[PDB]
Amino acid sequence: GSSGSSGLRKMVEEVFDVLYSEALGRASVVPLPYERLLREPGLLAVQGLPEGLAFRRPAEYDPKALMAILEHSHRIRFKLKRPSSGPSSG
Structure with missing residues (x-):
């Protein structure tokens, strides 16, 4: 089907x-x-x-x-109540 189509918020x-x-x-x-x-x-x-x-x-x-989020995203990191967060790759 379809899903979004170029959007600041849709990007985040x-x-x-x-x-x-x-x-x-x-x-x-x-x-x-x-x-x-x-x-x-x-x-x-x-x-x-x-x-x-x-x-x-x-x-x-x-x-x-949003623009600062998609740009700062590189930093944006989630933290679960549980330790040991699944790293992307690095």
Whole structure:
């Protein structure tokens, strides 16, 4: 089918998901239930975020933010309550 088509938020919409799934060590890319993760920060803490921002939906974020997220993404790193996070490769 289809899924997104060039979008600042749509670009990060997957990032957070990927990163999350990466830390989760899953096979498929799962979504990021902010409404939840937000409630409990201890459950999953977001690190390596784009300075001058706050962990929140990719939409809620600002315009330049998303751009700073996709740019700072290289830093963006998820942290699960459980130790030993699945590294990308490096």
